[PDB]
Every structure is written in C-alpha cells, then in structure tokens.
Amino acid sequence: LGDCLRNWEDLQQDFQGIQETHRLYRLKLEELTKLQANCTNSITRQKKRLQELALVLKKCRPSLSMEAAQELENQMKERQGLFFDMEAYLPKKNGLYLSLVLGNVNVTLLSKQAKFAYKDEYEKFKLYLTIILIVISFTCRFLLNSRVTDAAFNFLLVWYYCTLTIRESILINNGSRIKGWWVFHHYVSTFLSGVMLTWPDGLMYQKFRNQFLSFSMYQSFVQFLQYYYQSGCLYRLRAEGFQSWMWRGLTFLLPFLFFGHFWQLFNALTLFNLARDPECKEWQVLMCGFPFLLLFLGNFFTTLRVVHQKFHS
Amino acid sequence: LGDCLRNWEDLQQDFQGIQETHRLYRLKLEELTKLQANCTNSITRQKKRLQELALVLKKCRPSLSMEAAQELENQMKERQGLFFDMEAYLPKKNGLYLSLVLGNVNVTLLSKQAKFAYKDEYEKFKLYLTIILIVISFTCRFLLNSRVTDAAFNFLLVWYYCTLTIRESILINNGSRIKGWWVFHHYVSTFLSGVMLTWPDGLMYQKFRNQFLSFSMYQSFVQFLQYYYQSGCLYRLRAEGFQSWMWRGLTFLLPFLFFGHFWQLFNALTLFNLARDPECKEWQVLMCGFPFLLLFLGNFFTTLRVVHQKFHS
Numbered sequence: 001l002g003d004c005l006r007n008w009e010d011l012q013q014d015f016q017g018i019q020e021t022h023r024l025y026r027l028k029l030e031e032l033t034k035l036q037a038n039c040t041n042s043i044t045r046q047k048k049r050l051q052e053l054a055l056v057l058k059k060c061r062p063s064l065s066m067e068a069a070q071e072l073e074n075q076m077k078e079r080q081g082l083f084f085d086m087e088a089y090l091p092k093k094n095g096l097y098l099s100l101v102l103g104n105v106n107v108t109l110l111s112k113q114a115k116f117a118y119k120d121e122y123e124k125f126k127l128y129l130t131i132i133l134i135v136i137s138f139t140c141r142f143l144l145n146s147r148v149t150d151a152a153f154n155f156l157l158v159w160y161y162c163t164l165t166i167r168e169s170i171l172i173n174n175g176s177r178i179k180g181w182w183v184f185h186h187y188v189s190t191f192l193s194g195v196m197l198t199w200p201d202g203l204m205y206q207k208f209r210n211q212f213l214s215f216s217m218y219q220s221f222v223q224f225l226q227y228y229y230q231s232g233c234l235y236r237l238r239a240e241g242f243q244s245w246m247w248r249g250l251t252f253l254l255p256f257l258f259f260g261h262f263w264q265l266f267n268a269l270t271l272f273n274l275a276r277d278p279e280c281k282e283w284q285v286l287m288c289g290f291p292f293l294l295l296f297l298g299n300f301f302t303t304l305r306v307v308h309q310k311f312h313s
Numbered sequence: 314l315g316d317c318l319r320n321w322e323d324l325q326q327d328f329q330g331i332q333e334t335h336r337l338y339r340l341k342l343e344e345l346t347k348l349q350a351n352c353t354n355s356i357t358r359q360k361k362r363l364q365e366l367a368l369v370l371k372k373c374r375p376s377l378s379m380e381a382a383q384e385l386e387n388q389m390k391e392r393q394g395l396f397f398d399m400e401a402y403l404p405k406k407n408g409l410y411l412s413l414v415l416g417n418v419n420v421t422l423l424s425k426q427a428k429f430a431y432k433d434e435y436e437k438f439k440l441y442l443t444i445i446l447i448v449i450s451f452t453c454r455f456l457l458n459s460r461v462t463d464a465a466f467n468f469l470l471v472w473y474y475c476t477l478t479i480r481e482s483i484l485i486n487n488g489s490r491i492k493g494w495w496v497f498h499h500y501v502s503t504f505l506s507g508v509m510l511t512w513p514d515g516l517m518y519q520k521f522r523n524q525f526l527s528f529s530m531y532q533s534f535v536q537f538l539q540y541y542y543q544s545g546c547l548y549r550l551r552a553e554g555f556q557s558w559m560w561r562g563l564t565f566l567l568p569f570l571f572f573g574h575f576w577q578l579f580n581a582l583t584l585f586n587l588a589r590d591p592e593c594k595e596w597q598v599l600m601c602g603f604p605f606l607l608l609f610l611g612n613f614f615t616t617l618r619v620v621h622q623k624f625h626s
Contacts, residue, residue, distance in 0.1 A: 004373060004385055007366050011359070015392070018355045022399050025348045029402075029423055032345055035338045042331050046324075053320050060317065072317055079328070086335050089342075101476050103434055105420050105483065110342055114418075121416055148596070151511050163414055170418065198464050200513055283461070 040090045047083050050076065088115075088175035097169045107170050115174060116238065122167055123231055129160055130223045137220060141213040147201055150209070157193045157216075161186050181302045185295065192291035195284050204280045211267050218263065222256050229253055250310060254303075261300040268292035353403045360396050363389065401428075401488035410482045420483050428487060429551065435480055436544055442473055443536045450533060454526040460514055463522070467510050470529075474503045494615045498608065505604035508597050517593045524580050531576065535569050542566055563623060567616075574613040581605035 054076050061069070091106040098107065109115055136153045165186045172178060196212070199205055229249050236242045271289035274280060367389050374382070404419040411420065422428055449466045478499045485491060509525070512518055542562050549555045584602035587593060 001376075001378070001381055004366075004370060004382060007369075008385065008388065011363065011366075014359065018352075018359060021348075021352055021355065022402075025345075025352050026402070028341060028345050028348065032338075032341055033424070035334075035341065039331075039335055039338050042334070046327065046331065050324065053324075057317060063314075065314075068314055069317065072321065075321065089335075089339070101479055102415060102420075103431060103438075103480055103483065105422055105431065107415075107418050107420070109418055111346070118416060118418065125416075147511070155507065166414055167416055170416065194468065197510060198460070 036090060039086075043083055043087055043090075047080075050079055054080075092173055095169055095173055097165065098173065101166055107173060109174055115176075116234075118174065119171070119176070119234060120231075122171065123227060123234075125167065126164070126223065127227045130220055130227075133157070133160065133220045134217060137213055137216045141210070141217065145209075150213075151197065153216075154193050154197050158190055158197070161190045161193070179302065179306070181298055185298060188291050188294055188298075192288065192295070195288045195291075199284050199288075200282065202282070204274065204282050204285060207274060208271065208285075211270055215263055215267055219260055222260055225253055225256060247310065250307070254307065257303055258300070261296055261303070264292060264296040264299065268296060349403060352399075356396055356400055356403075360393075363392055367393075405486055408482055408486055410478065411486065414479060420486060422487055428489075429547075431487065432484070432489070432547060433544075435484065436540060436547075438480065439477070439536065440540045443533055443540075446470070446473065446533045447530060450526055450529045454523070454530065458522075463526075464510065466529075467506050470506045471503055471510070474499050474506070492615065492619070494611055498611060501604050501607055501611075505601065505608070508601045508604075512597050512601075513595065515595070517587065517595050517598060520587060521584065521598075524583055528576055528580055532573055535573055538566055538569060560623065563620070567620065570616055571613070574609055574616070577605060577609040577612065581609060 057069070057073065057076065063069075089110060091108045094102075094104055094107070109118060133153075133156065136156065140150055140153050165183065168178060168183055168186070172183070232249065233246065236245065268289055271285055271292065275285040275289065370382070370386065370389065376382075402423060404421045407415075407417055407420070422431060446466075446469065449469065453463055453466050478496065481491060481496055481499070485496070545562065546559065549558065581602055584598055584605065588598040588602065
C-alpha cells in the first residue's frame, strides 16, 4: 500500500492539468465547426451568384469595346479559380459512391501535408498489390492449371479493383482531379472478372485461358512502369526541364500502353470468333466479349486525349 | 458592360471579407492540430504509466488492511474509465482493415451528435438493403430458377457483407464496442457465398438450392425484427422501465434467433450427408459445409453469452 498510495497523489497532480487541457480543446473544437459552417456557406453562396452573373455574362457574351468583357471573363476565371482553392481546405460532402460505402463521414484531409502523403500511399498500394498479381498470374499460366486456383486469382482481381475505387473516390473528394473515365474503367473490369468467375469448365475455357492469363501478366507488368512514371512526377511536382521529363516520361511509356490496348482488342476478337463457333453453346462468352471491346474503345480513346492535351500544352 | 462592371465592385467588397475570414480559419485549424497532438500524447503517456502501476498493483495484489487496495483498484477502474472517455473525442489511428481499404484518413467523428447520427445511418442501411435481399431471394426460390439469377443474388450478398465490414470497423474506431465475433462472422459468410459462386451445375446443386435459398429468406426476414429491436433501443438510450423493455425486447426475439441457429446446423448436416453420397464428386460441397457448421458453433455460443450477461446484469 505504501507505494500504492504514493503514486496516486503525484499522478493525480499530473492528471489534473490533462483534465483542464481537454476542457479547452473541446471549446476550440466546436468554435472551429461554426467557423467551418459559416465559411462553407459563404463561398457556396457567392459561387452561386457569380455563376449566375457568369451565366449573365454568358447571355451577355453576344452583347459585344469588348476588351473588358474578355478581361472580366478572365476575372471570372480568376474568381472561380480562387474558390476552387479554398473549398479544397473546407470539408466537402461525400459523393454518391462514398455514401453507399463508408457512410457519411468527412474524409477531407485538411493540410497539404496529408493531401500529399495520401497520394503516395495510394501508389504504394497499387505497386505492392501488383507484384502479388504477377506472382499468382505467373503461377496460373505456367506452374498449375486448375479451376480452383484461377478462381483464387480472379477473386483477388475483383477485390483489387473494387478497393481501388474507394481509394480513388476519396481522392476526387479530397481535391484531386482524376479523369472521368478511369473511375468508370475500374467497374467494367470488375464486371469482366465477374462473368469469368461463373464460367463452367469445358471446351470453351481451355481456348480462352492462355489469352487471358498472359494478358493479365502483361497489363500487370505495365503497372510497374506507370509507378516509376508517376512517382517521379509527384516528387518533382512537390518542388521547364520538369516538363521535358514529363514529355520524355510519357514518350517512353506510350508504346507499351498502346501495345496493351491492341492486345485488349485482340482478346475481344477471339471471343466473338470463338462464340460464333457452334460448339461453344455458353451464354458467358458473348457477355464476356463486350467488356473487352468496351475497354479497348475507351482506353485507346482516352489515352489519345491526354496526349493531345500534352502536345497542345 | 454597364451591368458587367457594376456587379464586380460590390461583389469585390463582399469577397474581401470572405478572404479574411478564411485567413483566420487557417490559423485555428493548425492550432487545433497542435492541441490534438499534445492532448493525444499526454493521455497515451499517462495511460501507459497507470497500466504499469496497475501491473504493479497486479503483482502487488497478493501483497494483501487491504481495503484501500480494493478502493485504489476502483480508483484505477475510474481513471482508466475516464481516459476511455476523452480518447473517444480525439482522433484515433485506423485499425488494420481500415489501413488496407480507405487508407490512412481520420474517420473519427468528433461530436456526440455525429456519433449518434452515424449509428442510425448504419441501421437504415441494414434495413434498406435487407428488403432488396428478400425480394430477390423470394424470386430465386419461387418465380425463376437459373444459374444466372442465383449468381446475381449471390454477388449481392458478397457485396452486402463486405460493405457491412467497413461500416463496422469504423464504428469500432469511432468509439462503440461491437462484440469481437460479429466482425469475424461477416467474413465467414462472405467466404461461404464465395464457394457457392463457383459451384458447377449438376446433381449436387438441385439438392442444395431449396435448403439454401429459403434459409436466406428466413435470415433476411429476421433482420427486420432486429431493426425494430435495436432502433427502439437506441432512441431510448439517447434519453428502470427501459431495462424492462430491453429484457422483454430480447425475450420475444430470442426464439427466432435460436430457430435460425438450428436451421444453420441443419443445412450443415445436409451437406455432409450429401457429400458422403458417392454421386456428388464435387470438391465444393465439403468446403461449403464447414462455414455452415462454423457459423452455428459461433452464433449459438455467442448469443448465449450476451443473454447470460443480460440475466447477470
């Protein structure tokens, strides 16, 4: 007891200060929420008015002695630009997909330190899980051929893509701007790995395994390159010649990304050629073919856009 | 231009104040993070010391003129109780599953208003998606029998359970205390819906469809009752006789929850009885049987514990 009584009295002294510090923290927690409320309401209100006057300018654009109108348009371009900056700091309401999963919790990371550190943890997840795909997909093609192991690799893909969607819809809400297609692509590929999962073994499977498992290897290996491309881009973006690195970086990368897009079409063509063969008699082939064709029409098109912008700017 | 010039000068006046308000908000944002840092470090430090002295008391418990030791133990029970209160307010590091999915973003909802409003949105998600399960599972059993529609219902289950895991690992981190088993149960049932997905049609399937689809209906209908039980509990918890409602509420509910547990074992027994039949010759049956047996051993056991605590307290 002698020690048991002694520790309490001094521990009580230190506990007292900790109790009072938390009392102040509760105050500045609530006062900051009110500051979050007013500031959020103020910007969204003024953004509405200027958009109306921007609409007014839009209707008054033919009203063109018009040099101010172009400059006020630049001024409107400036004002909308600044409001897009501040709102990145304030909490933003979740989108649609983040209301189904993860619920209505504010996932907005305030400081730029966090907005940076999260982007790298997103990359370090794409790489770390990619090599696990290569190892398993390499085994399924060369070492062991069975429906159970191909189901284990396919279930990993359905999880890898569905997880990457949540880790991207946060980045859109966090303040970054990923192209509209990439979020949609992560769905079609999931639905693609869905139909393949319920394929029944037969003659149709052993004619569409090598062309799918090998393609899963090459696309996975390309992901290694995009890492060394984007990781190099982000660190420099944190800090002219960088634009040369950006152009030269995409230059070495574009052939491989186009090679994959043409392979994607070639796997699509096989299925339609395999389906029209009478011996197939499986519903799953033709509904598996369209995602492959759909992915090619999107990827080859969207990749051309980001390059056209790169040459333009 | 006359209107185009006029709006800017007054809009500039209002924009000025909004610019300065955001300037102060940036200050109290950072000062609160430092307050979050110090307060979080202070409690976790003192929690360690008292745990050591609690360990010291643990080793000095046989040292028993011991009435203070019991009271200091109560004092230790009080101190640990208070620290569990404050830390619920401060941000807490993500667990393990929330590091794989959703990344390292603070999902801690500070005010008690949010900690309450999230719990109801979790229930309102369990109900809203349950009736969609009943409608589809009712169709798959009576209206239409096909491998494609049963795959559509099964994929919905794999998503419904995997989504409920994220919406629960947040509640554990948010401050609630869900039993350890319930988070694990949402995995085994997912793995159960996994093996059934790769079942190949044959003689074994049409002998294990009615006993699974109907069981999926009854378990889904029970979920309607748990809603009217928990929703009634939470609203009263927000505010003696309530304990009578709690005891009477579980009393009417316990028979149905036990009826389901015995059905779970009965479906498990069929598979082992079906597997030992030579005509099956499918790997998926016996690996599908153990989850059904595993779920019964857990559910019937854990449900008995929460009732034993209810009678005890």
